[PDB]
Amino acid sequence: ASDSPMAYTDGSYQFILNADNTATITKYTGNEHRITIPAQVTHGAYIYPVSKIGDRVFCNYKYVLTSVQIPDTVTEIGSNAFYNCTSLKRVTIQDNKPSCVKKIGRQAFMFCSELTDIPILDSVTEIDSEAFHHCEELDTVTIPEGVTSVADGMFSYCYSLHTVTLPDSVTAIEERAFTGTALTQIHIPAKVTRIGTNAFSECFALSTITSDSESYPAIDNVLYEKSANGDYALIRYPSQREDPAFKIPNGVARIETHAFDSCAYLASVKMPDSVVSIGTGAFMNCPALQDIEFSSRITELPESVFAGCISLKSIDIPEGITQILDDAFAGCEQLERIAIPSSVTKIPESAFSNCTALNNIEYSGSRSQWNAISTDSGL
Ligand code: NA
Numbered sequence: 001a002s003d004s005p006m007a008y009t010d011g012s013y014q015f016i017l018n019a020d021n022t023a024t025i026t027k028y029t030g031n032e033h034r035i036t037i038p039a040q041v042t043h044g045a046y047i048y049p050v051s052k053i054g055d056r057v058f059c060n061y062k063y064v065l066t067s068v069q070i071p072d073t074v075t076e077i078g079s080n081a082f083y084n085c086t087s088l089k090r091v092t093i094q095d096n097k098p099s100c101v102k103k104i105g106r107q108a109f110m111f112c113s114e115l116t117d118i119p120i121l122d123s124v125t126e127i128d129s130e131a132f133h134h135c136e137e138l139d140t141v142t143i144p145e146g147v148t149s150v151a152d153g154m155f156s157y158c159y160s161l162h163t164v165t166l167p168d169s170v171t172a173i174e175e176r177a178f179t180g181t182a183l184t185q186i187h188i189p190a191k192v193t194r195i196g197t198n199a200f201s202e203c204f205a206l207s208t209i210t211s212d213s214e215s216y217p218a219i220d221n222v223l224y225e226k227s228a229n230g231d232y233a234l235i236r237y238p239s240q241r242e243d244p245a246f247k248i249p250n251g252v253a254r255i256e257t258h259a260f261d262s263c264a265y266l267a268s269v270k271m272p273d274s275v276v277s278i279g280t281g282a283f284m285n286c287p288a289l290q291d292i293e294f295s296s297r298i299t300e301l302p303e304s305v306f307a308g309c310i311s312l313k314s315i316d317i318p319e320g321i322t323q324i325l326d327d328a329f330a331g332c333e334q335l336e337r338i339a340i341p342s343s344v345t346k347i348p349e350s351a352f353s354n355c356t357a358l359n360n361i362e363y364s365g366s367r368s369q370w371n372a373i374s375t376d377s378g379l
Contacts (some may be wrong), residue, residue, distance in 0.1 A: 004016070004026065005017075007026050007027065008041075008043045010038065010041040010042055010043070011038070012028060012029050012030035012032075013025050013027070013028055013029075013037075013038060013041065014026050014027035014028075014029070015041050015043075015048070015050070015054075016054070017043065017048065018051060018052070020051070021046075021048065022048055022049050022050065022051035022052070022073070023041045023043075023048035023049070023050050023051065023052075024050070024051065024052040024053075024054045024078075025037060025038075025041075025050055025052070025053050025054050025057055026054040026057065027054075027057065028057050028058060031063045032063075032065075033063065033064040033065055033066050033067075034066060034067050034069075035058070035065065035067065035068045035069065036069045036094070037050060037053060037068070037069065037070050037071060037074065037094075038050055038071070039071035039072075039073050039094065040073070049073040050071060050073050050074060051073060051074060051075050051076065052074060052075065052076040052077075052078060053070070053074060053076070053077050053078055053081045054078045054081070055078035055079045055080060055081065055105065056078065056079070056080045056081065056083065057078065057081050058081060058082045058083075058085055059080045059081070059082075059083040059084065060083060060084045061082075061084075061085050064087065065085050065087060065088050066087055066088065066089055066090075067088070067089055067090050067091075067092070068082065068088065068090070068091045068092070069092050069093070069094050070091065070092070070093055070094065070099075070101070070120065071093070071094045072093055072094065072095075072097040072098065072099070072100045073100070074100065074101060075100050075101060075102045075103070076101070076102065076103040076104075076105075077101060077103070077104045077105060077108050077120065078105045078108070079105030079106040079107060079108060079128065080105070080106065080107045080108065080110070081105065081108045081109075082108060082109050082112055083107050083108070083109075083110050083111060084110070084111040084112075085109075085111075085112050085115075086111055086112065086113050086114060087114050088109075088112045088114060088115050089114055089115065089116060089117065090115070090116065090117035090118075091109075091115070091117065091118055091119070091120050092117065092119060093119055093120070098122065098123065099119050099120050099121070099122045099123050099124075100123065101120045101121075101123065101124055102123065102124060102125050102126065103124070103125065103126045103127075103128075104120070104121075104124055104126070104127045104128065104131050105128050105131070106128040106129045106130060106131065106151075107129070107130045107131065107133065108128075108131045109131055109132050109135055110130050110131070110132070110133040110134060110135075111133070111134045112132075112134075112135050113134055113135065113136040113137065114136075114137050115132075115135050115137060115138060116137050116138065116139065118132075118138070118141075121141065121142070121143070121144070122144060123144060124143075124144060124146075124147060125144075125146040125147060126147070127143075127147060127150075127151060127154060128151050129151040129152045129153055129154070129174075130151070130152065130153040130154060130156065131151070131154055132154055132155050132158060133153050133154070133155070133156045133157065133158075134156070134157045134158070135155070135158050135161075136157065136158060136159045136160060137159075137160050138155070138158050138160060138161050139160050139161065139162060139163075140161070140162065140163045140164070140165075141155070141161060141163075141164050141165070142164075142165040143164070143165065143166050143167055143170065144167060145167040145168060145169050146167070146169055147167060147169060147170060148169050148170060148171055148172075149170060149171060149172040149173070149174060150166065150170060150172070150173045150174060150177045150178075150199075151174050151177070152174035152175045152176060152177065152196060153174075153175070153176045153177065153179070154174070154177050154178075155177060155178050155181055156176050156177070156178075156179040156180060156181075157179065157180040157181075158178075158180075158181050158182075159180065159181070159182060160182055161178075161181045161182055161183065162181075162182040162183060162184050162205065163183070163184070163185070164178065164181075164183060164186075165187075166187065166188075166189050167189065168189050168190060168191060169189075169191065170189050170191065170192060171191045171192060171193055171194070172192065172193065172194040172195075172196070173188075173192060173194070173195045173196065173199045174194075174196040174199070175196030175197045175198060175199060176196070176197075176198045176199065176201070177196065177199045178199055178200055178203060179198055179199070179200075179201045179202050179203075180201070180202040180203070180204075181203055182204070182205045183200075183203050183205060183206050184205050184206065184207055184208070184240075185206070185207065185208045185209070185210070186200065186203075186206065186208070186209045186210070186223070186236070187210045187211065187212075188209075188210070188211035188212065188213045188216050188218065188223070189212055189213065190212035190213055190214075191213070192211075192213040192215065192216055193213070193215045194215075195216050195223075195225060195235060197256070197257060198257060198258055199235075200223070200235070200236040201257065201258035201261060201281075202258065202261060202262065203236070203238075203239060204239050204240075204262045204264075205239070205240060206236070206238040206239050206240055207238050207239075207240035207241060208221060208238060209221055209222065209223045209236060209238055211223065214226070216235075219249070220249075221238060221241065222234060222236070222237050222238070222246075223235050223236035223237075224252070225256070227253075230251070231251070231252075231253040231254075232249075232251055232252045232253065232254075233252070233253060233254040233255075233256045234248060234252050234254070234255050234256060234259045235256040235259055236259060237259055237260045237263065237266070239261070239262045239263050239264060240264060240265075241263070241265065241266070242265045243265065243266070244265065244266070244267040244268060244288075245266075245267065245268040245269075245270075246266060246268070246269055246270070247269075247270040247272075248269070248270065248271050248272055248275060249272065250272040250274055251272075251274055252272060252274055252275055253274055253275065253276055253277075254275065254276065254277045254278070254279070255271070255275060255277075255278045255279060255282045256279045256282070257279030257280045257281060257282065257302075258279065258280070258281045258282065258284065259279065259282050260282055260283045260286060261281055261282070261283070261284045261285060261286075262284070262285045262286070263283075263286045263288070263289065264287070264288065265288055266286055266288060266289055267288045267289060267290050267291065267311070268289075268290065268291040268292075269283070269289070269291070269292050269293070270293040271292075271293060271294055271295040271298075272295060273295050273296045273297050274295070274297075275295035275297065275298060276295070276297045276298065277298060277300070278298060278300070278301070278302055278305060279302060280302045280303045280304060280305070281302075281303065281304040281305065281307065282302065282305055283305060283306050283309060284304045284305070284306065284307045284308055284309075285307070285308040285309075286306075286308075286309050287308070287309070287310045287311055288311050289306070289309045289311055289312060290311050290312060290313065292306075292312075292315060294316075294317075294318045295318075296318060296320065297320075298318070298320070298321065299320055299321060299322050300321065300322065300323050300324075300325065301317065301321060301323070301324040301325060301328045301351075302325050302328070303325040303326045303327060303328065304325075304326070304327040304328065304330065305325075305328050306328060306329050306332060307327045307328070307329070307330040307331055307332075308330070308331045308332070309329070309331075309332050309335075310331065310332065310333050310334055311334060312329075312332045312334060312335050313334050313335065313336055313337070313357075314335075314336060314337040314338075315329075315335065315337070315338050315339070316338075316339040317338065317339060317340050317341060317344065318341065319341040319343055320341070320343055321341060321343060321344055322343055322344060322345055322346070323344065323345065323346035323347070324340075324344060324346070324347045324348075324351045325346075325348065325351065325377060326348045326350045326351065326377050326378075326379060327350050327351065327353065328351040328352075329351060329352050329355055330350060330351070330352075330353045330354055330355075331353075331354045331355075332352075332354075332355050332358075333354065333355070333356055333357060334357050335352075335355050335357055335358050336357045336358060336359055336360055337359075337360040337361075337362065338352075338358065338360070338361055338362070339362040339363075339364070340361060340362065340363045340364070341364050341365075342363070342364050342365030342369055344373065345372070345373055345374060346373065346374045346375075346376070346377065347373050347374075347375060348375055348376065348377040349375050350377075
């Protein structure tokens with residue numbers, strides 16, 4: 001269908017009729033700053049309980065909006081229902097009754113950056129992608145038993161969110177689910193079998209990691225992904241961990257993207273030769289990082305790998321690296337010396353951008369070989 005179903009009006013609300021003799025609110029035509037979703041609507045000879053807030057009803061609401069009250073008849077909140085309601089403080093249940101909300105749609109509260117009170121989460125079984133993306137004032141969240149995954153970007157950039165309780169029923173934490181949050185600790189429940197890329201990237205306040213998952217063990221307070229073949233990928237080193245040095249264990253095959261981003265204290269890192277690849281921005285914004293011992297089996301320095309590593313003074317790029325990608329050392333203001341092997345044939349101009357102390361480039365090849373290095377790479 002290229003059109004939505006036939007809608008009726010009851011006061012400031014429009015609605016459609018559901019197959020189970022309930023109604024879905026599809027439009028709001030008022031301009032209140034304190035919203036009360038109706039528990040019932042009338043059409044013809046019948047009264048319909050309101051079971052759903054339709055997709056986008058308050059999406060980009062142009063008027064001032066501070067609070068929303070939902071009746072306990074509502075079992076579903078549509079996608080983008082309160083998208084960009086940036087002064088919305090609270091979403092409560094009428095008469096302080098228990099929430100009956102079971103499903104929350106994609107981006108339902110995305111950009112509700114002042115939202116602090118959300119009791120609608122208490123009996124939910126499904127929450128879709130980015131439902132609380134940029135809810136910058138949420139402080140603690142409890143996901144109830146019955147939720148089976150944390151959908152992608154669910155709490156991305158929830159800057160105040162310092163504690164999240166995940167239930168035993170969660171089997172997946174999707175991509176970017178907690179990117180940029182204020183989590184001080186993480187507990188991975190036993191049934192987690194998938195953690196998506198950057199689920200814990202930019203977690204600047206993280207100090208402890210615990211896990212009951214055999215697929216995602218916490219080994220010496222570091223989160224890993226363990227593959228069926230026994231290989232491990234290091235996925236999250238806690239940024240607030242105070243140890244000046246860390247040696248990545250033998251048996252780790254990959255340092256995943258942003259695994260060591262924003263480490264406030266880490267000064268020295270050592271890689272085993274089992275490490276064959278490093279993800280984008282693996283050590284970005286590590287301001288105390290001074291010494292790096294590389295694996296002999298890596299062949300690339302990925303994008304932004306050491307971007308913002310402002311204490312880095314000297315670095316020896318291992319023989320066998322064939323390319324140094326965009327922004328690899330961008331903003332390394334104290335970098336004075338870099339040894340580049342003749343195997344490096346690609347270095348974009350941005351790789352050493354804002355490297356004002358850089359006065360000693362030790363290149364093991366000839367001037368002709370140096371001039372043959374390609375400076376081409378997209379963004
Ligand atoms: Na090598």
